[PDB]
Amino acid sequence: GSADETLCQTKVLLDIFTGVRLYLPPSTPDFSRLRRYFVAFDGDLVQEFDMTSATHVLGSRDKNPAAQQVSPEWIWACIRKRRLVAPC
Protein backbone atom coordinates (compact mmCIF):
# COMPACT_ATOMS: atom_id res chain seq x y z
CA GLY A 1 0.00 0.00 0.00
CA SER A 2 1.17 2.97 -0.63
CA ALA A 3 -1.75 4.72 -2.23
CA ASP A 4 -3.62 4.80 1.04
CA GLU A 5 -0.45 6.24 2.45
CA THR A 6 -0.06 8.65 -0.40
CA LEU A 7 -3.51 9.44 -1.57
CA CYS A 8 -4.17 9.65 2.08
CA GLN A 9 -4.06 13.32 1.34
CA THR A 10 -7.21 13.68 -0.66
CA LYS A 11 -5.61 12.97 -3.95
CA VAL A 12 -2.32 14.32 -3.17
CA LEU A 13 -1.14 15.11 -6.60
CA LEU A 14 2.27 16.63 -6.59
CA ASP A 15 4.59 17.43 -9.47
CA ILE A 16 5.18 13.73 -10.01
CA PHE A 17 4.22 12.72 -13.53
CA THR A 18 5.15 16.32 -14.28
CA GLY A 19 4.44 16.42 -18.00
CA VAL A 20 4.38 12.64 -17.91
CA ARG A 21 1.90 11.36 -20.45
CA LEU A 22 1.25 7.85 -19.28
CA TYR A 23 -1.63 5.85 -20.73
CA LEU A 24 -3.67 4.91 -17.67
CA PRO A 25 -5.57 1.71 -18.45
CA PRO A 26 -9.14 1.34 -17.17
CA SER A 27 -8.22 -2.15 -15.98
CA THR A 28 -5.61 -0.60 -13.71
CA PRO A 29 -6.43 -0.62 -9.99
CA ASP A 30 -7.24 2.70 -8.35
CA PHE A 31 -7.84 3.95 -11.88
CA SER A 32 -10.53 6.24 -10.50
CA ARG A 33 -7.92 8.55 -9.03
CA LEU A 34 -5.04 7.25 -11.11
CA ARG A 35 -6.66 9.08 -14.01
CA ARG A 36 -7.92 12.35 -12.59
CA TYR A 37 -4.99 12.26 -10.19
CA PHE A 38 -2.33 11.79 -12.86
CA VAL A 39 -3.51 14.13 -15.61
CA ALA A 40 -4.42 16.30 -12.63
CA PHE A 41 -0.83 16.60 -11.42
CA ASP A 42 -0.17 18.37 -14.72
CA GLY A 43 0.48 15.50 -17.11
CA ASP A 44 -1.84 13.87 -19.64
CA LEU A 45 -3.60 10.58 -20.29
CA VAL A 46 -4.18 9.03 -23.71
CA GLN A 47 -6.68 6.28 -24.44
CA GLU A 48 -5.05 2.94 -25.18
CA PHE A 49 -6.24 3.07 -28.79
CA ASP A 50 -5.12 6.69 -28.52
CA MET A 51 -1.44 7.30 -27.84
CA THR A 52 0.33 7.70 -31.17
CA SER A 53 0.99 11.19 -29.85
CA ALA A 54 0.77 10.07 -26.23
CA THR A 55 3.92 10.08 -24.12
CA HIS A 56 3.44 7.51 -21.39
CA VAL A 57 1.49 4.27 -21.11
CA LEU A 58 0.56 2.28 -18.01
CA GLY A 59 1.38 -1.39 -18.41
CA SER A 60 2.32 -2.12 -22.00
CA ARG A 61 3.14 0.25 -24.84
CA ASP A 62 1.97 -1.48 -28.01
CA LYS A 63 -0.87 0.99 -28.45
CA ASN A 64 2.00 3.46 -28.37
CA PRO A 65 5.63 2.31 -28.36
CA ALA A 66 6.55 5.99 -28.27
CA ALA A 67 5.05 6.24 -24.80
CA GLN A 68 6.40 4.96 -21.49
CA GLN A 69 5.62 1.53 -20.10
CA VAL A 70 5.23 2.65 -16.49
CA SER A 71 3.30 0.87 -13.76
CA PRO A 72 1.24 1.66 -10.65
CA GLU A 73 4.41 1.65 -8.57
CA TRP A 74 5.82 4.39 -10.79
CA ILE A 75 2.98 6.79 -10.06
CA TRP A 76 3.48 6.35 -6.32
CA ALA A 77 7.27 6.48 -6.41
CA CYS A 78 6.86 9.40 -8.81
CA ILE A 79 4.22 11.45 -7.04
CA ARG A 80 6.06 10.78 -3.84
CA LYS A 81 9.33 11.73 -5.48
CA ARG A 82 7.65 14.87 -6.75
CA ARG A 83 9.61 14.06 -9.89
CA LEU A 84 8.92 11.42 -12.51
CA VAL A 85 11.06 8.42 -11.63
CA ALA A 86 12.17 5.41 -13.67
CA PRO A 87 9.09 4.23 -15.57
CA CYS A 88 8.63 0.46 -15.47
Q: Specify the CATH number for the domain of residue 74.
A: 3.40.50.10190
- Spatial distance between the Cα atoms of 84 and 52, rounded to a whole number of angstroms: 21
What experimental approach yielded this model? NMR
Q: How many domains does the chain have?
A: 1
- Spatial distance between the Cα atoms of 3 and 55, rounded to a whole number of angstroms: 23
Closest CA to 40 of 69, 11, 67: 11
Which residues 6+ apart lie within 8 Å of 22 measured at CB? 38, 43, 45, 55, 56, 57, 58, 67, 68, 70, 74, 75, 87
3-state helix, strand, coil in the chain (%, to 5): 30, 5, 65
The parent domain of residue 60 ranges over 1-88
